[PDB]
Design a binder for this molecule. Structure first.
Ligand code: HEM
Ligand code: HC9
Ligand code: FES
Lengths: 27, 470
């Protein structure tokens, strides 16, 4: 979780969430 | 695994490559230069321009590999005139010009206030207020024209709109840039931003040693533009800081990003002020150019405009007027924004310096190499997008989750993606909701408008819209 829970990366992968996923999120 | 030197290339002489680029394509057409290069070399190539060598990629499959190998503190290409100005004139740098641990500390503090859902929900009424005033400007101009109609180039108005918006979310205060009589000093800030970008171009691909020697006039103009940016941003921050102490009151209502950062963050005042400067400058030319392209594509594609209007009207009804609820009921509109950035990116490329050796297309790319993804060329490439010249928002709604794989790159990717991404997306979605509810947009004597590289990509010539009340 590099961005630290602000929906600003995708390193926590376990409309905005949908886009981070194309490139569920743990946070 | 083929060595680096076998990657297709015009040659190893950077100054000769620069010479041919300027002569055949020109500085303001670097996006075309990328298109032509992939057609000449294939899906990967290297080119040394002046002092800077890069590997260029276009395939989303190679893009995926680049971003998977990314380290914790990514670095993109730094604009040398920007760096030289900050170093020489000793200006404090923000997140854009920082690296490693110092970048991370700023970014993490900023993300809490500008990226996180809990922070961004507060932006809605601040951005909605500005968009509603933009609508009123247009209705007023329609009344004055007397024809039930308004035609004009609204690029200047879009710059003012973008400025009102960014200042409202940062400062929690309206600057009055949408009133009939405008603050001339705020207008000077807007103009300087445009100048800073425009004057950056003739100095690209050159070391600072050569700037002042062969681009002395441009450098001087560039320095003057940054000085305006810094003067006014610093005055805004200074005034806000002191007025806060004059009114010394804890607030329960949201007061803006700056209030949040000054009130409770790990950032020093000097880091805060540096970053405010970068947020304000980032806020003006990008969303305004992107919105202009969107309106252009809606005027060019009247069936798509109709579809978007109908979705917005359904969403306003379904939400019973609540903006927060509405923003989850407009998937086609959000897609049309992705689609606008596909065809008309702000950023010609994304770039990363490799932390480790990396294989792309059976070529070994050594660590510390600069790798660039050609965003503009990707968006026009018929092998990666079906009918690329067609403005088709549904393209992004496809259940075929392969068609969209590493395609949405307008705001970059990962931990160092666009810092203003949420602000920009919200500002543009809210703007277009208000516009679609109030007006039909057309272009009389429609013609294809090209693109020019002014550091950011921009329409090559003015676009004159006609607005009808709906
Ligand atoms: C249509 C609107 C915009 C577009 C298309 C856009 C595009 C971009 C891109 C492509 C990057 C590089 C990302 C990467 O390297 O992965 C970037 C970075 C950045 N943007 Fe934007 N941007 C927009 C609006 C804004 C706004 C409104 C702000 C104001 C907050 C802003 C501030 C920044 C900053 C400070 C960075 C550097 C962040 C860092 O290095 O940590 N941008 N933007
Ligand atoms: C004014 C700033 C404080 C923030 C502006 C920022 O929101 C955005 C417009 C900037 C940030 C990084 C910039 C990129 C940095 C690196 C390059 C590589 C260069 O070859 C072309 C310009 C290009 C592609 C820049 C285009 C403009 C970008 C995308
Ligand atoms: S931690 Fe960055 S997206 Fe969840």
């Amino acid at each position: 979780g590099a961005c630290e829970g602000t929906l600003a990366c995708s390193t926590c992968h376990l409309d905005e969430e949908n886009d981070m996923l194309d490139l569920r999120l743990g946070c | 695994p083929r060595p680096f030197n076998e990657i297709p290339s015009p040659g190893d002489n950077g100054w000769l490559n620069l010479y041919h680029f300027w002569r055949e394509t020109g500085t303001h057409k670097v996006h075309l230069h990328h298109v032509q290069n992939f057609q000449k070399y294939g899906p990967i190539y290297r080119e040394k321009l002046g002092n800077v060598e890069s590997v260029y990629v276009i395939d989303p499959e190679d893009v995926a590999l680049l971003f998977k190998s990314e380290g914790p503190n990514p670095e993109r290409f730094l604009i040398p005139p920007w760096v030289a100005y900050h170093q020489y004139y000793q200006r404090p740098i923000g997140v854009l010009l920082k690296k490693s641990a110092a970048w991370k500390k700023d970014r993490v503090a900023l993300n809490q206030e500008v990226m996180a859902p809990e922070a961004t929900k507060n932006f809605l009424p601040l951005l909605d207020a500005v968009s509603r005033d933009f609508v009123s400007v247009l209705h007023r101009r329609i009344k004055k024209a007397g024809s039930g109609n308004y035609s004009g180039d609204i690029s200047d108005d879009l710059f003012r709109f973008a400025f009102e918006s960014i200042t409202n979310v940062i400062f929690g205060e309206r600057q009055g840039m949408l009133e009939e009589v405008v603050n001339p000093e705020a207008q000077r800030f807007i103009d300087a931003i445009y100048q800073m970008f425009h004057t950056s171009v003739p100095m690209l691909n050159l070391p600072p040693d050569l700037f002042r020697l062969f681009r002395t006039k441009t450098w001087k103009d560039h320095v003057a533009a940054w000085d305006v940016i810094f003067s006014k941003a610093d005055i805004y921050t200074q005034n806000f800081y002191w007025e806060l102490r004059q009114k010394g009151s804890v607030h329960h209502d949201y007061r803006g990003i700056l209030y949040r950062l000054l009130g409770d963050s790990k950032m020093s005042f000097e880091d805060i002020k540096a970053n405010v400067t970068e947020m304000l400058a980032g806020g003006v030319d990008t969303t305004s150019m992107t919105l202009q392209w969107h309106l252009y594509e809606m005027a060019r594609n009247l069936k798509v405009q109709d579809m978007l209007r109908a979705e917005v009207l359904a969403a306003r009804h379904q939400a019973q007027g609540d903006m927060a609820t509405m923003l989850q009921l407009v998937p086609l509109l959000k897609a049309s924004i992705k689609e606008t950035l596909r065809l008309h990116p702000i950023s010609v490329t994304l770039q990363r310096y490799l932390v480790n050796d990396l294989v792309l297309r059976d070529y070994m790319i050594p660590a510390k190499t600069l790798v660039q993804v050609a965003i503009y060329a990707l968006g026009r490439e018929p092998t990666f997008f079906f009918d690329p010249e067609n403005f088709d928002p549904t393209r992004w709604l496809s259940k075929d989750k392969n068609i969209t794989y590493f395609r949405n790159l307008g705001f970059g990717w990962g931990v160092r993606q666009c810092l203003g991404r949420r602000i920009a997306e919200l500002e543009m979605t809210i703007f277009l909701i208000n516009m679609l509810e109030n007006f039909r947009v057309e272009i009389q004597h429609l013609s294809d408008v090209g693109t020019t590289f002014n550091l950011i990509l921009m329409p090559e010539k003015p676009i004159s819209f006609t607005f009808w009340p709906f």
